[PDB]
Amino acid sequence: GLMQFTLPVRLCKEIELFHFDIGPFENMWPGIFVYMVHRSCGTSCFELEKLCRFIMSVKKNYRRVPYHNWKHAVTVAHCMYAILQNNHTLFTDLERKGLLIACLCHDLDHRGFSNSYLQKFDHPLAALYSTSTMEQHHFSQTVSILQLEGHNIFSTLSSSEYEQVLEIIRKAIIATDLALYFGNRKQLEEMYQTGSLNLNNQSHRDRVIGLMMTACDLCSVTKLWPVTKLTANDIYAEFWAEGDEMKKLGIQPIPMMDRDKKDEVPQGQLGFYNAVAIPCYTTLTQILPPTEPLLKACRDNLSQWEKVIRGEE
Numbered sequence: 001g002l003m004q005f006t007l008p009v010r011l012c013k014e015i016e017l018f019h020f021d022i023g024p025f026e027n028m029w030p031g032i033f034v035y036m037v038h039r040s041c042g043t044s045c046f047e048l049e050k051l052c053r054f055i056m057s058v059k060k061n062y063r064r065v066p067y068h069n070w071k072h073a074v075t076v077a078h079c080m081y082a083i084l085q086n087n088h089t090l091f092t093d094l095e096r097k098g099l100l101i102a103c104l105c106h107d108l109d110h111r112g113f114s115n116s117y118l119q120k121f122d123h124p125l126a127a128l129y130s131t132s133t134m135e136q137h138h139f140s141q142t143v144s145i146l147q148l149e150g151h152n153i154f155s156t157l158s159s160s161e162y163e164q165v166l167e168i169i170r171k172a173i174i175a176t177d178l179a180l181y182f183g184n185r186k187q188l189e190e191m192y193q194t195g196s197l198n199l200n201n202q203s204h205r206d207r208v209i210g211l212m213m214t215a216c217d218l219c220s221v222t223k224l225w226p227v228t229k230l231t232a233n234d235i236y237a238e239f240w241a242e243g244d245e246m247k248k249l250g251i252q253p254i255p256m257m258d259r260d261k262k263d264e265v266p267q268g269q270l271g272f273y274n275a276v277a278i279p280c281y282t283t284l285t286q287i288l289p290p291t292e293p294l295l296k297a298c299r300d301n302l303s304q305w306e307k308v309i310r311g312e313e
């Protein structure tokens with residue numbers, strides 16, 4: 001256990017910042033993740049051989065799709081790392097263990113299609129899981145990989161601690177269904193404003209961890225503008241392929257997914273920042289003040305989309 005992972009200087013410094021981009025070198029992403037586990041959890045948290053085997057099977061179970069791919073998994077895990085490292089004393093040891101794994105696993109075996117497309121196509125997954133269809137699938141894939149021989153990274157926990165970590169992971173992964181975010185955020189907003197928010201209340205922590213999951217999942221809007229803008233291309237590449245598959249079933253896609261409305265993307269981003277992203281980081285910053293850099297970066301990117309609309313960029 002004298003075997004620390006170490007990053008080149010620029011990465012060692014910049015990985016601590018919320019806006020870090022993990023880079024185009026896929027083969028460095030596993031080491032970046034182990035580095036983050038070792039600092040946010042400890043060199044004691046997992047056996048290195050088991051953790052390495054788990055990461056590589058997780059990678060193999062992400063698909064070659066434009067956005068919901070292995071790079072997205074590691075990107076979402078890094079945003080969680082930055083949240084955890086900026087709120088040293090707010091989280092339990094089980095939470096530090098579970099949440100980086102949940103982030104790495106949270107889109108396992110994504111096919112690049114929405115819950116709504118699986119329901120309209122009548123995919124078998126839509127009959128097995130009637131709500132949060134893909135997110136129940138991602139959690140089921142995580143359990144599968146944890147059960148492969150030599151892949152049980154939680155083997156040193158008691159039965160009850162193992163049950164607890166798998167429940168943190170399950171709830172964190174379900175919470176990445178954006179349909180559930182609007183309601184979660186409204187309850188958190190009321191709880192904060194009436195001062196009823198209690199981090200010793202388990203159902204309150206669960207809500208706060210859900211919002212952390214949304215914030216990490218949406219973190220492309222918190223990056224430097226060139227990263228944000230190029231990530232948006234990948235996001236729409238998926239939506240528009242789904243739009244094409246909606247038109248093949250004889251269904252007009254929603255505007256978000258209709259490549260004929262390419263021109264409105266700037267205005268679509270404004271709506272998304274104002275309805276989803278800004279509210280997300282605003283409520284997160286109220287509950288967890290040291291996450292403010294996420295809100296500040298989001299607002300800078302909103303202002304860049306505003307520039308695009310005025311043709312100033």
Ligand SMILES: Cc1cnc(C)n2nc(CCc3nc(N4CCC[C@@H]4C(F)(F)F)nn3C)nc12
Binds near residue numbers: 267
């Ligand atoms: C989940 C998520 C994560 N991260 C990001 C950055 N995004 N961007 C989105 C798309 C947002 C969105 N774009 C549109 N547009 C685009 C043109 C037509 C339509 C409108 F007519 F509005 F302009 N509608 N909507 C709702 N969804 C996400």
Ligand SMILES: [Mg+2]
Binds near residue numbers: 106107134176177
């Ligand atoms: Mg997802």
Ligand SMILES: [Zn+2]
Binds near residue numbers: 072076106107176217
């Ligand atoms: Zn995701």
